[PDB]
Amino acid sequence: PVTDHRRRRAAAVISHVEQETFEDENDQQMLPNMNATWVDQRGAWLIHIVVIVLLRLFYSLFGSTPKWTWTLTNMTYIIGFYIMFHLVKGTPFDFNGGAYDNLTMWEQINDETLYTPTRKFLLIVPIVLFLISNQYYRNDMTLFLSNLAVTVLIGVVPKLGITHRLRISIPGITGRA
Amino acid sequence: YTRVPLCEPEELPDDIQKENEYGTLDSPGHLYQVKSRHGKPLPEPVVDTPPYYISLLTYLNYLILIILGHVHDFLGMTFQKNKHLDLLEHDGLAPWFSNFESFYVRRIKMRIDDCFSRPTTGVPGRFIRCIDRISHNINEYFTYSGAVYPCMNLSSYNYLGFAQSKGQCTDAALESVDKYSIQSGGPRAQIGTTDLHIKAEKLVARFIGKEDALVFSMGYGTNANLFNAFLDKKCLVISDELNHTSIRTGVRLSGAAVRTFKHGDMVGLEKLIREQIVLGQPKTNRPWKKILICAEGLFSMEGTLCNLPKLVELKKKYKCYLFIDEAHSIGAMGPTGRGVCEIFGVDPKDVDILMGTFTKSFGAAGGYIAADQWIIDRLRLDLTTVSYSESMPAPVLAQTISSLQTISGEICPGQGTERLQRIAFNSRYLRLALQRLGFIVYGVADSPVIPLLLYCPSKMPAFSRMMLQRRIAVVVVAYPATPLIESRVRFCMSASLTKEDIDYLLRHVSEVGDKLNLKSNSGKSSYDGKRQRWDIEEVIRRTPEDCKDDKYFVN
Amino acid sequence: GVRLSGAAVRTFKHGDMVGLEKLIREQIVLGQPKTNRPWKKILICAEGLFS
Ligand SMILES: C[C@@H]1CC[C@@]2(OC1)O[C@H]1C[C@H]3[C@@H]4CC=C5C[C@@H](OCCC(CO[C@H]6O[C@H](CO)[C@@H](O[C@H]7O[C@H](CO)[C@@H](O)[C@H](O)[C@H]7O)[C@H](O)[C@H]6O)CO[C@H]6O[C@H](CO)[C@@H](O[C@H]7O[C@H](CO)[C@@H](O)[C@H](O)[C@H]7O)[C@H](O)[C@H]6O)CC[C@]5(C)[C@H]4CC[C@]3(C)[C@H]1[C@@H]2C
C-alpha cells in the first residue's frame, strides 16, 4: 500500500483507542467541530433544569405516588442523557474524511480537555438530583438500591478520569485506531 | 411539465428594459462619499441578544426534531425495506452514501427545500424573473407551468450594477467575439496566451497598486492550487476560524500544520505566535521554516472588517508573512475602490500577496493574484494551473477590462463615483432604518451585506414564503452553516435599486415582522441607550437626512 | 581548559565503545538542554597512552 489507511478491530477484554498520527491529528482537526461547540454557549446550562421540571410536572399530571414519579423522572433523565452523549459514536455530517469515527460527543467536548467547568456541572447535576429525590422513598430499600445503582453505573462511572477512551468487546468487537 | 420550460424572450421597448435592469436617480441628494480612517483603530464590536425563552424554545424544538427523526428512521428501516432500497446492500455492493452522514439533509432540510434552488431567467438586474412550480408529496418533485413573474432582487451578487445587456461592456464583448472566437487553444504555456492577457494583467497591476499580477479562469482554483507551490510539511499556517472552503482545501493539499485563532481576538493570536515560535516543530523542536498568516477582507456572513494595521505591525515585529483575500472588498469599498487598504490608508507594499474575484462586482468570472516581481516570476514557473489547465476566454476579458476602465475613470466619466455613492447611501439608509424599527442588524455601518437574525427554526419558511408572495426575493441560512441559536436572512444591496423600492421593502418587512413577532432589541443598538419602537412613516420621513451623519452608528 | 571554555561535558567509561556510540546517538538526537536545538559541533578528546 502507498497510503496505509485502515481501521483496526482488535479484540480484548480491555482496550484503548490509539493516539492519532500526525496527519490525522495536527491537520485534520483544525476547523470548529460544530458538534460540541454549542455546549459553551448561551442558555446551555438552564435547559437541563427546565427538562427536569417539565418531566416532573408531566409525571405529576398523571396523579401517581411521589416515589414512583421521582424514580421514573431520575431514570428517564439519566437514560436520555446517556443515549444522547455516551452511546452514539461519530458525527452526523462529514468532517474531513471521517476523522471522528472512533469517539463519542463526550470525548469531543472542549477538544478532549479533561477538566472544564461544563464537565464539572454535568457531573454535579445527577448527584444533587439524587439527594433531592431520595427523601421520598427512603423507607423502601429496593427502590433506594435501584436508584443508587442507576446513578452510579450510568451517570457517574462514564464521567470519570478513568474510562476515558475505554472500550469493552463484550457487546461487540469495537474499533480502535 | 416535469422538465424546466425554456422561456421565449419578451418583446419590449428599449426604455422599459433599461429601467428594468438599471434604475434612474430621482434627486441628487441620495449620494454619499466615504471618508478614510487615518489613525482611528477599529473598536471591538458589540452584539445584542434576545431574552432566554427564545433560546429555550429553540433547544426544545431541535430536541423534538432529532428524537422523532431518529425514531422514524429506525422504525421505517426495521419494519420495511422495499422502499428503502438505496440505503441497503444489493448484490454484494455497498450503498453510495451512508445513513448517519446524511441525517440532516433528509430529515430536516427536505421539508423546507422549496426555499432553495429556485430557477430564474433573464438578466439578474433590479427585477429578476422567476419560473413558478408546484410542490408535490413533501418537496419531492415539482411540476412547472408556462408562467413567469418578476420579483424584486435582494439575493444576487451585483454591487455596482454591471449586469446589464445594454452598455459599453456588452458592445466590447460582442466586438471581442467578432475578432477573437470563443475557442481557447489550450494551456497558457503552450498556445493559450495572447496580447489581451498581457493587457489585462498590466491593467490589473496598475489598478491594484502592486508591481505585477496574473489572471485565472476560476476563483476556486486560485486558492485550491496555490499553497503547494511554496509550502511543505515544515511550515505553520495561522488562520481565522471563518475562512472559505477553498483556502482550507488548498492548505490540506499543501500539508502544512494548521492552528486557528478566535475571530476578532488579537491577544490570542499574539500568544499563539509566541508559543509556536518558542516550541518549534513537533517531536523534534526545530524552529519553523516560515510562518504564514491568512485572513479575509470582509466576512460575508457578518459584514465585519479585519484589523489590518495590527496584523501588519505584528508581522513586522515577529517576522511573519501576510495573505489577504479581497473577494467582497474590491471595487466596492473605499473612496475609489482599491479595497480595505484604501479604507485604512495602509500602503499595499506591506501585504505580500493579494487576491480577488471579478464575479461579485465586475460581472464576469475569474480571479487574480498580485505580488512583487521575483515572487511572481518564480510562481509562474512553479504553478500547476498555468501549464495543466485551460485559458480564459475573450468575452470575459473584454467585460473585465471595460469594467475596470470605467471604474478607474479612463472611459465613461462620472459613472463609477455615482455608483459608489449610490451603494453607500443605500446600505447606510437600510441599516439605520432596520435598526430604528426594532430588529437586530449586524455588521459595520457601510457593508453591502445586511444580516437579520431569525432565531426560531419555524420562522424561516414562513418569512420566506410571505416575502415571496409579496414579490421580494430573500436568502435564508441555518444550521449547520450558522450556529444553532443564530439563524439569519442575508440582504445584498445593489447600486441599481432606488429609495422607493427601499420604502416598499421596509413597509412589507415591518408588517411581516410585526405579524411574526421578530422585534427583539435590548437597547444596545441605540446610541442613546433606549429601546426603539418607532413608526414606519416617521422612520421614512426622518432617516434619509440623518443617514449621512456618522454619530447614529454604534459601529 | 574545558572548564575555562564553558562547553557541555559528558564522559564515557574507559574502554567501552558501545556506550560511546549510544551517548553520541542520544546527544545528536536530543540537542541542547531546554531548547532541543542541534549542537553546533562535537569534539572527542582522548589520550594516546595512559600512564
Ligand atoms: C418496548 C420498549 C419501548 C421503548 C423503547 O424500548 C422498547 O423503544 C425503543 C426505541 C429505541 C431506539 C430505536 C433506534 C435507535 C437508533 C439507533 O441508531 C442510531 C443511528 C446509528 C448510530 O450510529 C452508529 O452507526 C454508525 C453508522 O455509520 C456507525 O458508525 C461507524 O461504523 C460504520 C459502519 O459502516 C463505519 O463506517 C465507521 O466505523 C463508523 O462510521 C456506528 O456503529 C454508530 O455510530 C445506528 O443505527 C443506524 O445505523 C445502522 C447501521 O448502518 C442502520 O442499519 C442497521 O439496521 C437495519 C434496520 O433495518 C438493518 O438492516 C441492519 O441491522 C443494519 O443495516 C440502522 O437502521 C440505523 O438506525 C440508536 C438507538 C436508538 C435511538 C434506540 C434507543 C432505544 C429505544 C429508544 C427503545 C426504547 C427504550
Ligand SMILES: CCCCCCCCCCCCCCCCCCCCCCCCCCC(=O)N[C@@H](CO)[C@H](O)[C@H](O)CCCCCCCCCCCCCC
Ligand atoms: C413523551 C415521552 C417522554 C418525553 C421525553 C423524551 C426524552 C427526554 C429526556 C431527556 C433527555 C436528556 C436531555 C439532555 C439534552 C438537553 C437539550 C438538548 C437540546 C438538543 C441538542 C441538539 C444537539 C445537536 C447535536 C448534533 C449531534 O452531534 N448529534 C449526534 C451525534 O454526535 C447525537 O448522537 C444525537 O444528538 C443523539 C442521537 C440520539 C437518538 C435518539 C434515539 C432515541 C429514539 C427515541 C426513544 C426515546 C428516547 C428517550 C427515552
